[PDB]
Write a protein that binds this ligand. Structure first.
Ligand SMILES: C[Si](C)(C)CCOc1c(S(C)(=O)=O)ccc(C(=O)C2=C(O)CCCC2=O)c1Cl
Ligand SMILES: C[Si](C)(C)CCOc1c(S(C)(=O)=O)ccc(C(=O)C2=C(O)CCCC2=O)c1Cl
Ligand SMILES: [Co+2]
Ligand SMILES: [Co+2]
Lengths: 381, 381
């Protein structure tokens, strides 16, 4: 059931902004590890005395990395005279965020028809305001409301190139890396209590619950009208034999925040070959692979969607597989992106639900919790 | 003249420690950009609830990257029960350092015969104490005194594998990168006033001034007895047409700190080929190359040390060349390592002064200030 109850018109995920201590080193690491091109900048070289922001792109996926300069560089500025390209930025907030949570996502940004309207309707419907709507160079409007923890949902709308005051980066400085990643599929938050978080977010967005099909968590997924903006939320379950990884997140993160970003690839096998080649030379590591029993058991569950070669090519790369009543999902998870066991990345590819592919085809891998358990015990014997 | 007036026995540069916001991303970036292997760790996986520290090595060069975890992870600890592997570490100091200066060097560490003695004699001779001598697992002694700004000179001595509580990293996780870098040649500080900084440091070390042979700086070099520990210090010169880059450093860094690290390569040409291949795929960028006139003028000044092929191979790579009355130096400079125009890296190779090669053979490139000026104007015509 899709009641299509969005309270304002939502388009697609627009970008994800990381708040960093040094944006240069995180951005260069991510570019190599994920195969994303440097495409725009806003920093001292573009007149920004407030923050350094570097934009990486791969297909429609946009990763923004932002860090504060010394406040002394802009101590004479006021908001009307600011040189910041992102008017919501605040030195204090950024330093406080990074010292509290370490490296992670500050903004989940979605493009909307009218960011001023989205903001007004959101806060009229219970959203906690974070940064009021601001029109940038009469062309782009940005607004922000609290999402969970210190993460904001950022609305961006365009009258008619990332943001004004960002410059396209020099072709010499911009190497065309590409490992097949194409867009953000979903963005997942961890919270102490799922109910109140769901009530808050669905309350001010009108996003509806996306239908699904002992592991220490409960979750639900909020979706926009066409189900292309997908926001799962996890809560821990206490008392289990193995401590809830959601609780471990909340402790190391100092509370609620973004748990993982799921990046759709147009060829997950090429992506995983390319990322795994770079794991030990500056890229990302991957979760330990499932046992061979998991891949032995894949014939019975998806033998009609994947060939024997494609299945064995999953086992080489550690890829996980799950299936809906509509489609099939291939997924794999990185180790944490930084020092703390908090944010990680998911690479996914969806098979089926062709009408274009409808959003969320195949689900989010719920069945793989039960299946991973079965396979580790089967394999032991 | 070398009066050999060290007040305690100094051996070699031991390591350089960067204070970071996220040590993982900086370390992985540096590993790829510089060709340094991951060789030791101290973090949550080794029982350290206080800080994440990752060690990169290339030859004798040791780069340590350290960031704080949430203080809540260790809130029940006291110094006698600490899980930190580096007892001088302090959450507050580290966060304050990084928020003030951004990414940069916290410790210049030299190995000495007796770190307790080095500390006592240092502070008896005017050194400002920073962290008292501590014996780690009855095997290694660490002590720290203020050097300049928020940079400490760290003494390490071994009774008889980096530090106790660090683990050798998994061979699978430890890819054997190597672009030819072999050891730290010198480490350079920028200060507002050269005189008082020199008086302080030479006062408590007994290091002597190393003999040398309109650009906005004055400098001098302090050296240990065998001149293998080399600590140049710069001060700005005000009033010049072009603003002193030393003054620009002090402003963006919020005061005194480490300006550059000079890394000796056993084959600067291989190093520069390897680093330049990676500049736009996650590595380091290099200063703009000098004009062809600089390389035309190299025949007259070093045509008896470098072949025509070797000279043209310098021009391909942007390498700079200078000469002492004893030896010849090849050098090149990276762009700043992080967001701020502060710390950068120098790659160097020294030719001559064979006895082993005596320290500082060829100098530090003083002649290249005058020569670069001459060459840009010559080239214009
Ligand atoms: C952190 Si973990 C030590 C890697 C153990 C969890 O990992 C998985 C696994 S699975 C079989 O690996 O356990 C499967 C799916 C997902 C996943 O994406 C996801 C959603 O997007 C929304 C619903 C909640 C959820 O879980 C995740 Cl996080
Ligand atoms: C920051 Si800059 C925009 C790259 C301009 C400076 O660069 C250079 C140049 S040179 C010809 O490039 O001007 C040559 C040598 C060195 C150098 O290493 C050095 C020492 O170790 C100790 C003495 C002081 C000193 O300067 C440097 Cl920093
Ligand atoms: Co997911
Ligand atoms: Co130098």
């Amino acid at each position: 059931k899709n009641p299509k109850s969005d309270k304002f018109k939502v388009k697609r995920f627009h970008h994800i902004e990381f708040w960093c201590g040094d944006a240069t080193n995180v951005a260069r690491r991510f570019s190599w590890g994920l195969g994303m091109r440097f495409s725009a900048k806003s920093d001292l070289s573009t007149g920004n005395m407030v923050h350094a922001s570097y934009l990486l792109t791969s297909g429609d996926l946009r990763f923004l990395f932002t860090a504060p300069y010394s406040p002394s560089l802009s101590a004479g500025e006021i908001k009307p005279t600011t040189t910041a390209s992102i008017p919501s930025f605040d030195h204090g907030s950024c330093r406080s965020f990074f010292s509290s949570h370490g490296l992670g996502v500050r903004a989940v940004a979605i493009e909307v028809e009218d960011a001023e309207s989205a903001f007004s309707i959101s806060v009229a419907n219970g959203a906690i305001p974070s940064s009021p709507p601001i029109v940038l160079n009469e062309a782009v409007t940005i607004a922000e409301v609290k999402l969970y923890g210190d993460v904001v949902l950022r609305y961006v709308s365009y009258k008619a190139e990332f943001l004004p005051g960002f410059e396209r980066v020099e072709d010499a400085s911009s190497f065309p890396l590409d490992y097949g990643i194409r867009r953000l599929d979903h963005a997942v938050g961890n919270v102490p209590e799922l109910g109140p978080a769901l009530t808050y977010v669905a309350g001010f967005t009108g996003f509806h619950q996306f239908a699904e099909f002992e592991s220490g968590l409960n979750w639900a997924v909020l979706a926009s009208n066409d189900e292309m903006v997908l926001l799962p939320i996890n809560e821990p379950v206490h008392g289990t034999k193995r401590k809830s990884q959601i609780q471990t997140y909340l402790e190391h993160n100092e509370g609620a925040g973004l748990q993982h970003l799921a990046l759709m690839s147009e060829d997950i096998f090429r992506t995983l070959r390319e990322m795994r080649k770079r794991s030990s030379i500056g890229g990302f590591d991957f979760m330990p692979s499932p046992p061979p029993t998991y891949y032995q058991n894949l014939k019975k569950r998806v033998g009609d969607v994947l060939s024997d070669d494609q299945i064995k090519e999953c086992e080489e790369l550690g890829i996980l597989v799950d299936r809906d009543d509509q489609g099939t999902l291939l997924q794999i998870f990185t180790k944490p992106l930084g020092d703390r066991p908090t944010i990680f990345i998911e690479i996914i590819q969806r098979v089926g639900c062709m009408m274009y592919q409808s959003g969320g085809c195949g689900g989010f891998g719920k069945g793989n919790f039960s299946e991973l358990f079965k396979s580790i015990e089967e394999y032991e014997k």
